[PDB]
Amino acid sequence: PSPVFDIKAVSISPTNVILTWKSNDTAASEYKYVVKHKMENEKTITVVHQPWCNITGLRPATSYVFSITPGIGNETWGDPRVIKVITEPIPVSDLRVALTGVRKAALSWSNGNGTASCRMLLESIGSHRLQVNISGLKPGVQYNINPYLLQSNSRDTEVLLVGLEPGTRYNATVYSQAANGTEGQPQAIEFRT
Ligand SMILES: [Pt+2]
Numbered sequence: 001p002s003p004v005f006d007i008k009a010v011s012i013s014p015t016n017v018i019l020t021w022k023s024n025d026t027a028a029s030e031y032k033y034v035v036k037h038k039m040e041n042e043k044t045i046t047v048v049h050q051p052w053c054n055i056t057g058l059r060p061a062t063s064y065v066f067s068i069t070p071g072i073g074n075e076t077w078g079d080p081r082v083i084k085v086i087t088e089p090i091p092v093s094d095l096r097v098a099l100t101g102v103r104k105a106a107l108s109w110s111n112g113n114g115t116a117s118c119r120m121l122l123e124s125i126g127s128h129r130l131q132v133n134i135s136g137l138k139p140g141v142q143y144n145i146n147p148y149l150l151q152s153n154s155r156d157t158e159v160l161l162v163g164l165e166p167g168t169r170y171n172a173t174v175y176s177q178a179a180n181g182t183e184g185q186p187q188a189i190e191f192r193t
Contacts (some may be wrong), residue, residue: 001028001070001072001077001078001079001119002023002024002025002026002027002070002078002079002110003023003070003078003080003081004019004021004023004051004068004069004070004081005020005021005023005025005081006022007019007021007068007076007081007083008021008022008185009083009085011087011088012102014058014060014061014087014088014090014091014114014184015046015057015087015090015145016053016054016055016056016057016058016059017036017056017058017085017087018053018054018055019052019053019055019066019083019085020051020052020053021033021051021052021068021070022051022063023051023070026138027072031051031070031071031072031078032047032048032049032070032071032072032092032138033044033047033048033049033051033053033068033069033071034038034068034069034071034077035047035055035066035068036066036067036069036085036088037064037066037069037102038065038066038144039058039064040065041118042087047163051140058066058087058090058183059087059114060087060089060090060112060113060114060178061087061089061090061113061114061115061116061178061179062086062087062114062125063081063083063084063085063086063087063180064085064087065082065085066082066083067080067081067082067083068080068083068084069081074120075172085177086180086182087182088111088114088176088178088182088183088184088185089112089114089115089116089172089176089177089178089182089183089184090112090114090176090184091112091175091176091177091187092109092110092111092112092115092118092157092174092176092184092187093094093110093111093112093180093187093188094108094109094110094156094163095107095109095174095187095188095189096108096109096189097172097191099179099191099193100101100160102164102166102193103161103162103163103164103166103191103193104160104162104164105160105161105164105170105191106158106159106160106161107159107161107172107191108156108157108158108159109156109157109174109187110155110156111139111156111157111176112155112176114148114175114176114181114184115139115177115178115184116139116177116178117136117137117138117173117177117178118138118139118157118166118174118176118177119134119135119136119137119141119174119175119177119183120134120137120172120173120174120175121133121134121158121172121173121174121175122134122147122161122170122171122173123167123170123171124168124170125162125168125169125170125174125190126168126169127168129136130147130151132147132150132151134147134159135180136141137157137158137159137174139156140154140155140156140157140159141145141157142158142159143153143157143160144159144160144161144162144186145159145162146161146162146163147161147163147164147177148164148165149163149164153159163193164193166193167192167193168192168193169190169191169192170190170192170193171188171190172188172189172190172191172192173186173187173188173190174187174188174189179190
């Protein structure tokens with residue numbers, strides 16, 4: 001009847017996540033547990049002998065609520081423990097780059113429904129060098145920044161990177177962020193001037 005604990009949700013996709021937990025607290029290890037979904041309009045009640053569950057068929061940018069309750073026999077139920085789980089936005093799609101003239105590189109992508117903002121990470125590759133972290137992109141807007149300046153201190157995204165130095169190879173690594181403050185999986189692209 002002892003509550004669950006060290007609860008953790010391994011995110012495999014923006015559509016399914018694996019909840020894995022522990023219980024013990026005396027009585028060795030031989031119990032049964034019940035999980036509850038609240039994805040509204042329908043209430044789902046999953047019961048698993050093992051201390052882990054596969055929750056599938058979820059929405060990317062939305063957060064669901066789950067409750068885990070350990071049981072032993074029948075009415076022999078224990079206590080409820082509740083977790084709030086946010087899933088990943090769909091990663092940025094149509095990731096593209098188009099360099100215009102040796103010191104300038106334009107890179108375009110299409111965000112997706114769930115995304116509210118993007119986080120780009122720009123790095124040079126090979127130099128006796130930068131690694132800037134362009135936080136807070138927006139969908140549908142057009143940006144244009146010299147990233148080397150920042151070192152010293154429809155629904156698409158249009159970002160031109162100027163002031164680039166020839167002969168050096170760059171990576172752009174773009175992550176999709178949601179209003180709930182949770183990053184999706186990254187999408188990278190390379191270009192060299
Ligand atoms: Pt469900």
